[PDB]
Design a protein around this ligand. Structure first.
Ligand SMILES: COc1cccc(C(=O)N2CCCC2)c1
Lengths: 300, 237
């Protein structure tokens, strides 16, 4: 089990760690989060009590180094940093633990939710999307835009998701205009799975990281990606039987985890009614359909 | 974006554009089968692709063979129109290619956009206008050339005949739509009005009689009357 000590909490702030979050008052003695399950990606995130604009955060894997949080007042925000001195680090983590200055990652034993929301999310793949390779962790936030949102403006700060566009030469084979646009199996299976992602896991991993960035940061372009990658699967008549079953699990937990009131912005009426009721796969997402109809029956 | 009442007059600037109407592409007759079921019989169609500034009508005949062996033919029709329009564009010199293609029905937008991907700078636009181009098969000469065809094929006509020698395209196009509107509303009546005077004749490379200016004003008012007449009859007013 690993730790993310904090130097201090200078400003009032709501802290998120994965799907949890805690309030911290200005100069309240708070010095980090402990008992973070080793073995998956994590994300720590922030929203200042004073300015709810710009939620921001750091994806990270403690198996990649020792990470702490330090507020920076020239820049006015909590910064993830790496300690190259292991000895110095453990020494600090143990003192805060003994003083008990740390909240414990409140993992319920029965709960696989986070595992389930990040099953295919790999830190290496994350740092390809958020390019900043002098850090082992990756900053993301509300306003950050995608390479597709820039094509329709700063590049170093872009979310380099895979571009998916159903009216692009990429997606449509000459002489199969009608076929490929009504049935996108080519685009998914040859162009996307075999061509760019290599496997279904890397695909599912980006889809999940997009979902998480929309939900924790209200990053609108990650929302768009997420829907694009659902719609692509759903708009193919030929999808490995195993990818359908996994996608149905994937979405279920994404649906289960969404805040109920946030439904109007993180769910796209059109795509879901299509995927669940018009798409080739309308009959393939039994758990996702069931939870959607029982929890957000309005949208459909 | 969409063509509507605001920007009517862009149709007559010097930016090359084409209208495409696909209503007459897939034409069918319904009838009862011997068993008493209902079946369809396809007949020859036509893509209506019209440049409103010059009057040139790139009438692509759609032979019933093209449907043979196909499902969702109403939906294939839209994709076949787009394929043929693209080939028309592709076949034209570059300085002839349209800058805009205005589809009369919004269903044609995605097929044409997909077929035109190689022309990212040609804009596909819808229109909120109700244009009466489905009545094109009411022009005897188009209807004849379509129904006689034994193979896919493209016919050429000036939809304005020689009108632009004496009048502008704005005025030509208004004359065209009036005439087509009438034909749509009451074909029999409209035709009667056009041909009652057997001394006025239709030239060979033309679709409409050779009316003089004064004779067009007379025709033009009689169509208006025809169109009003038919409305009260429809709506009781
Ligand atoms: C279709 O493009 C054109 C161009 C120039 C002239 C014409 C024209 O008036 N015709 C063609 C044969 C019958 C009448 C058509």
């Amino acid at each position: 089990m690993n730790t993310v000590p904090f130097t201090s909490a200078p400003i009032e702030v709501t802290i998120g760690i994965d799907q949890y979050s805690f309030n911290v008052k200005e100069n309240q003695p708070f010095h980090g989060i402990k008992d973070i399950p080793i073995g998956h990606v994590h994300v720590i995130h922030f929203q200042h009590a004073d300015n709810s604009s710009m939620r921001y955060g750091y994806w990270f894997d403690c198996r990649m180094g020792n990470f702490y949080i330090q507020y920076d007042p020239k820049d006015g925000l909590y910064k993830m940093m790496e300690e190259r001195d292991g000895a110095k680090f453990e020494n600090i983590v143990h003192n805060f633990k003994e003083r008990q200055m740390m909240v414990s990652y409140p993992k319920i034993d029965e709960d696989d939710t986070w595992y389930n929301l990040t099953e295919f999310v790999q830190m290496d793949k994350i740092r390809k999307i958020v390019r900043k390779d002098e850090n082992q962790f990756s900053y993301v936030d509300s306003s950050m835009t995608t390479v597709q949102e820039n094509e329709l403006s700063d590049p170093a700060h872009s979310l380099n998701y895979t571009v998916i566009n159903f009216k692009s030469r990429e997606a449509i084979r000459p002489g199969h205009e009608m076929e490929d646009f009504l049935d996108k199996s080519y685009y998914l299976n040859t162009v996307m799975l075999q061509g760019i992602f290599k496997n279904s896991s890397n695909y599912f991993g980006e889809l999940q990281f997009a979902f998480l960035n929309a939900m924790f940061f209200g990053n609108y372009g990650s929302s768009l990606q997420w829907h694009a990658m659902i719609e692509l699967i759903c708009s193919s008549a030929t999808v490995p039987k195993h990818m359908l079953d996994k996608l149905d699990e994937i979405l279920y937990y994404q649906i289960k985890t969404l805040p109920e009131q946030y439904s109007d912005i993180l769910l796209n009426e059109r795509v879901w009614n299509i995927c669940l009721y018009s798409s080739f796969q309308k009959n393939s997402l039994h758990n996702t359909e069931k939870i959607m109809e029982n929890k957000y029956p309005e949208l459909l | 974006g969409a063509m509507n009442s605001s920007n009517y007059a862009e149709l007559f600037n010097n930016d090359i554009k084409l209208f495409v109407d696909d209503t007459n592409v897939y034409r069918v007759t319904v009838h009862k089968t011997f068993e008493g079921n209902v079946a369809t019989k396809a007949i020859n169609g036509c893509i209506f692709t019209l440049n409103p500034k010059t009057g040139h009508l790139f009438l692509k005949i759609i032979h019933t063979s093209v449907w043979a062996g196909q499902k969702r033919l109403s939906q294939l029709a839209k994709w076949k129109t787009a394929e043929e329009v693209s080939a028309l564009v592709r076949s034209l010199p570059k300085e002839e290619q349209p800058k805009q293609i205005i589809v009369t029905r919004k269903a044609m937008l995605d097929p044409l956009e997909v077929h035109m991907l190689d022309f990212p700078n040609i804009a596909i636009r819808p229109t909120e206008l109700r244009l009466p181009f489905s009545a094109a098969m009411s022009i005897d000469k188009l209807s004849d050339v379509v129904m006689k065809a034994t193979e896919p094929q493209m016919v050429l006509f000036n939809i304005y005949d020689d009108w632009l020698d004496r009048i502008s395209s704005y005025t030509a196009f208004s004359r065209l739509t009036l005439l087509l509107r009438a034909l749509k509303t009451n074909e029999e009546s409209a035709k009667m009005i056009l041909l009652s005077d057997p001394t006025i004749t239709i030239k060979s490379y033309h679709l409409w009689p050779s009316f003089t200016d004064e004779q067009w004003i007379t025709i033009e008012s009689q169509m208006r009357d025809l169109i009003l007449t038919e409305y009260g009859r429809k709506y009781n007013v």
